Design a protein around this ligand. Structure first.
Ligand code: 2RY
Ligand code: CL
Ligand code: CL
Length: 175
């Protein structure tokens, strides 16, 4: 009887946007329904004078069975009452023509080794998430330290997404 309601989930307390900046390599992911980033998913976060966070994100996308596309996207993050929860507005500059928006929750991070991202797109009537995606980010693409592995596995299970993540490759397909 685990509480899988989206409102009951806990996020990074006192989230620091400036310390979260820099390169983040997604090593594992949980997919939503429909088309989504496949692999080689690298994120680059930044903060400006005003303190508003922004980021760029590259990644390979399998559109049809015989077409690979290195998506190159830019996004801005709007602040909310919770410092770890944001409203991400994003768009493409290479292939993706349209724009969209999702919630961007930093569930937990130590800023210099790992980070667990979460985003619920659709909510069930009971409060649980009907359609979600999540990323296990890392500063080092070679791997995570032992302590980072333990926290990630714990947070993944607390989000009710145990054994639903798949690993993803970084082989320089998009440079
Ligand atoms: O859904 C998409 C792109 C998309 C939209 C519509 C159809 C297909 C796709 C996809 F490219 F296949 F994923 N997202 C959501 C997640 N989004 C991110 N996820 C994790 N971190 C980041 S940092 C950042 C984005 C971003 C978008 C812009 C800056 C990547 C773009
Ligand atoms: Cl699409
Ligand atoms: Cl694009």
């Amino acid at each position: 009887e685990r509480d899988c309601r989206v409102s009951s989930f806990r996020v990074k307390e006192n989230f620091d946007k400036a310390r979260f900046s820099g390169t983040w390599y997604a090593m594992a992911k949980k997919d939503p329904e429909g088309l989504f980033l496949q692999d080689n998913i690298v994120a680059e976060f930044s903060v400006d004078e005003t303190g508003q966070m922004s980021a760029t994100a590259k990644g390979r996308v399998r559109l049809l069975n015989n077409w690979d596309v290195c998506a190159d996207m830019v996004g801005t993050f709007t602040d909310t009452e919770d410092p770890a929860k944001f409203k991400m507005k994003y768009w493409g500059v290479a292939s993706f023509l349209q724009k969209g928006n999702d919630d961007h929750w930093i569930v937990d991070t130590d800023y210099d080794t790992y980070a667990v991202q979460y985003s619920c797109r659709l909510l069930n009537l009971d409060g649980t998430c009907a359609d979600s995606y999540s990323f296990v980010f890392s500063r080092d693409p070679n791997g995570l330290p032992p302590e980072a592995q333990k926290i990630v596995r714990q947070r993944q299970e607390e989000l009710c997404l145990a054994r639903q993540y798949r690993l993803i490759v970084h082989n320089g397909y998009c440079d």
